[PDB]
Amino acid sequence: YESYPYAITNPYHLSTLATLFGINAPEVENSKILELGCAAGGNLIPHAVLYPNAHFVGVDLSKVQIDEANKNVRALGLKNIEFHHCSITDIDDSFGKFDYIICHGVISWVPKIVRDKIFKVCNRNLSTNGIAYISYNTLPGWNMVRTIRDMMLYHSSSFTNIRDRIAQSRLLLEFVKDSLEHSKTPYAEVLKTEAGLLAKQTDHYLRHDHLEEENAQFYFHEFMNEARKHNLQYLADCNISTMYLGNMPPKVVEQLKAVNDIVRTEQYMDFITNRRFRTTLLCHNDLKINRNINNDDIKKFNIIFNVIPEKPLKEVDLNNATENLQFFLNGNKESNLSTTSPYMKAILYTFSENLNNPLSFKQVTSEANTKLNNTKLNEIKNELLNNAMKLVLQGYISITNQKHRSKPVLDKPKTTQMVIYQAKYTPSMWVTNLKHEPIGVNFFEKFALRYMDGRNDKKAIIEAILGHVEKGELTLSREGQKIENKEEIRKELESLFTPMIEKFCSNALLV
Amino acid sequence: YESYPYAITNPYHLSTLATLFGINAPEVENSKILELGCAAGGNLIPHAVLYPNAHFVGVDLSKVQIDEANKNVRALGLKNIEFHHCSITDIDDSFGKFDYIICHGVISWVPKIVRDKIFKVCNRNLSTNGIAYISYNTLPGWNMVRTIRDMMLYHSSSFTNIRDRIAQSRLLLEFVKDSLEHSKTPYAEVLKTEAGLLAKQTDHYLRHDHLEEENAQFYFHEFMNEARKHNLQYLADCNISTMYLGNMPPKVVEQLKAVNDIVRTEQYMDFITNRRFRTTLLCHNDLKINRNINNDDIKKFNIIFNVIPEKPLKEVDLNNATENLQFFLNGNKESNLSTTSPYMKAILYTFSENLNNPLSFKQVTSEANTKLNNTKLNEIKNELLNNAMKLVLQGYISITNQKHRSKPVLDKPKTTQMVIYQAKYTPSMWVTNLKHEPIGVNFFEKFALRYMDGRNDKKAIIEAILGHVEKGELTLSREGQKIENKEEIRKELESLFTPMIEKFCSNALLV
Numbered sequence A, B: 001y002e003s004y005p006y007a008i009t010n011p012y013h014l015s016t017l018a019t020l021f022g023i024n025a026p027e028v029e030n031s032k033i034l035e036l037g038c039a040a041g042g043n044l045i046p047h048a049v050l051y052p053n054a055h056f057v058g059v060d061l062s063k064v065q066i067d068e069a070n071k072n073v074r075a076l077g078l079k080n081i082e083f084h085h086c087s088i089t090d091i092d093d094s095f096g097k098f099d100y101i102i103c104h105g106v107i108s109w110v111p112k113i114v115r116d117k118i119f120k121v122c123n124r125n126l127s128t129n130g131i132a133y134i135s136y137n138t139l140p141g142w143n144m145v146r147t148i149r150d151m152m153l154y155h156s157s158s159f160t161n162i163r164d165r166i167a168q169s170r171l172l173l174e175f176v177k178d179s180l181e182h183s184k185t186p187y188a189e190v191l192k193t194e195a196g197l198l199a200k201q202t203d204h205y206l207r208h209d210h211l212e213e214e215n216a217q218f219y220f221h222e223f224m225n226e227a228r229k230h231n232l233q234y235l236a237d238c239n240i241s242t243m244y245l246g247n248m249p250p251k252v253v254e255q256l257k258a259v260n261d262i263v264r265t266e267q268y269m270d271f272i273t274n275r276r277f278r279t280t281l282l283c284h285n286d287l288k289i290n291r292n293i294n295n296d297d298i299k300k301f302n303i304i305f306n307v308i309p310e311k312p313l314k315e316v317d318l319n320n321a322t323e324n325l326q327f328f329l330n331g332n333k334e335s336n337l338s339t340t341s342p343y344m345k346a347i348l349y350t351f352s353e354n355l356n357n358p359l360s361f362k363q364v365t366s367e368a369n370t371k372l373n374n375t376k377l378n379e380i381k382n383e384l385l386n387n388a389m390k391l392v393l394q395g396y397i398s399i400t401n402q403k404h405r406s407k408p409v410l411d412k413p414k415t416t417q418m419v420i421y422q423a424k425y426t427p428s429m430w431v432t433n434l435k436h437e438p439i440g441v442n443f444f445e446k447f448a449l450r451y452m453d454g455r456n457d458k459k460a461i462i463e464a465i466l467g468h469v470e471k472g473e474l475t476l477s478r479e480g481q482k483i484e485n486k487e488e489i490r491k492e493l494e495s496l497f498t499p500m501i502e503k504f505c506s507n508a509l510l511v
């Protein structure tokens, strides 16, 4: 019962993935967004703060949460969002026509009647050019998760209390990690890791009630068949890399490319890759979508490539073409790309100081062009054009319709309204950034964001945080777990401050 | 659509696992054996030839098969066996009470009503000390088989031909064996193998009607649940090694040993080992079974350990404890065991000349004591006593209630009546041995067995086969590639003869 944002749900990501396929979706700046199964609305409210001219509606069956959502909407003072306590089946054509309909993690947990109704409202209540989003669990991938859920019910059947039946399942998952300690068999690998990721989870799914729930257990084509019954058509997935073919032998790529149905192509890919989950984008049946995508399409979007250089800029010469420089993707150990070309090296160093900041094609191109003394522009353009889209379809590069943001002022840092409201008034250990992603903080950053407005500067902010450490409410961790009253504060804050402002500036927490 | 014997179904194997657990099952020599879903009865008739004083009944729904069964029963002239074309549902209480009821690979393919009936007839028609056998596909193991079968139907629907849609799925399993050519991922392993053993299967399993069939998809505890409704109790599995614990951390063995339930012990092992199949032995609820098994219980049975030494006896000294001798189990490279102990060396060299010939504890012990110069009797006994049961519950050693057989006479070898009928009048490349196992023969072996009666000897048998090669009907080629004159044969017959009499003598094909 903690409401998280899901960045894959952002209406801007749907407008972008549509724009990539040829549909012009409504503008998000002023739109109608619907959320089926909202509450507590952490996937809705942060949008209503950033877009005051759009209209947000949300629907849920738990009154407990719909009241909490309204408790936050009342604290932030928003007029553009309203939450309704009712069921999806209660939505007629009078609700209006929405530009983006977001259904996340519900349609597989509800009875067939509610399913048919969701498929209806994604037709009756969807605009002419609008877009619908539905996430669900698929087969075969879910076969393992179902199995574990059965293995826990069969065990936890010997215990009754809701306080006894949970830690029990948590002890059965440990018992599984013990009996499989020494196993070569390739199956005990999947079971070992899936019980490790289920054991890491907390108490919500693990309640023996949620384990009794039956899942729609879709196959992608059964889902699409119920979708075409309602005159909807498959747009794309929200992870474009899941649609990536090849990374596959070329005779099979040719075969699949021969068949002209994308649905039984994605089905096959589901069968051979053991897909367990899908985030599907649906659009009205009357739209003509274009699947011929070429490198030159990279100019229609703004680009985000989060790469951390392996050596600082002033420490290298880009024209050294024998030097093989490598960059790490949001991280890292391994997960890296190495280039020896001066133009690709100039582009990645531009992407490495713009982290999580959309950049147009002329901004990436011109800003990489001044590291090369303004002479090499056409060679920069020619490498971006060539490798770009190819890297967008593999997932490494993110495209967006969101505009570039002005580099923040770090004199007196200033964060967004949503994260000051989450830092001051909220028990949660994470905040929502401008990209609609939850990012973690440890009580120090949270307290810092409490005081980060365009007013308090470095000194003032630290003295306030210190104010918290006295009444604390505030520990000092390090290596560590000790604080000496004076020598472990105000000399330990000035250390952690600069890099934390780094993390904020590069994670889109500063406006 | 070829009738095969299943050695794991032999009433003597059930009488043996029962004896092992404390139940005295009826004599197999004269009993009442039932088979649900028998025809064409290749799993029944070979028993009716060896036990003329026992009564065999079988039931099947295919007249096409019951006609063949009845024709083979007519060709052998058997009065002790009768086949009925009817349904399991057509069974009265008037059918009698059978000492062994054998249901192999049906209960998962039949509607819930027929399942109810099978569990019923395994109660009302089973004797007081009798035993029932039911094999079925289980979960989780079957999930993969379900996936693949769905993967074929969804594919093969684009054409409706019973002759097209088959070689179609045959080419889809190839499209699967290709697109996974280079893959590390362990799921592509499971899928790689499961499509490989499915493509090796031929034209029947793939019939696309039998892909349309739905499986009961049992869990062991759901099966034991329908068994206890009918007052049946779990006896054991016909693969004793599947009930073996550890191979498992001793804390996990202790934990399972704490809860006393055999059903949820086998259920948890089914969960962690991904059990796909079960051959279950059921017995009446009123019986007291003993699960305490001690090393010295190996004296109640007769022993078969098929080991092929790596060195001839005359080539080694058993008394040398510095020599590490290696033995191969039914084969082989790979599966083998090496021992340096002189007593285990005398026991394994005693089991290696008795292959597939049950041997009592005093025969193994007395014959292994004469290899050590008759000084070691109590040391041989104590090593058999110790390692025996431990190796029986692991699968390496076979126990049986069947008696030792008199060493056959190789002057004029004489094979059993069942394989003479199969050699002469059946176009099968395999015959059924005395242990009820199908064993292959190649065109030479078949022709040889045609003439093996207690009359024809070496020269005569060879002249007969030579006669065949003249009219042949028999192509004899060395590699070689077309021997073939006159005494380049009869010199190839005296060659192929001796190793074949060895092969027959140790496969229980010679009486």
Ligand SMILES: C[S@@+](CC[C@H](N)C(=O)[O-])C[C@H]1O[C@@H](n2cnc3c(N)ncnc32)[C@H](O)[C@@H]1O
Residues within 6 Å of the ligand: A004, A036, A037, A038, A039, A059, A060, A061, A062, A086, A087, A088, A089, A104, A105, A106, A109, A110, A114
């Ligand atoms: C299965 S939960 C998933 C919650 C959330 N989207 C997530 O995973 O983070 C679905 C949410 O939908 C709401 N819900 C369930 N059934 C509904 C229905 N029939 N009509 C409207 N809302 C419903 C519930 O309050 C529940 O919190």
Ligand SMILES: C[S@@+](CC[C@H](N)C(=O)[O-])C[C@H]1O[C@@H](n2cnc3c(N)ncnc32)[C@H](O)[C@@H]1O
Residues within 6 Å of the ligand: B036, B037, B038, B039, B043, B059, B060, B061, B062, B065, B086, B087, B088, B089, B103, B104, B105, B106, B109, B110, B114
């Ligand atoms: C899987 S095959 C049986 C295999 C069995 N393990 C054997 O080979 O001895 C299923 C056979 O069972 C028979 N059968 C199917 N349904 C039956 C029913 N309801 N009653 C009796 N026999 C049935 C059919 O004749 C079919 O040939």
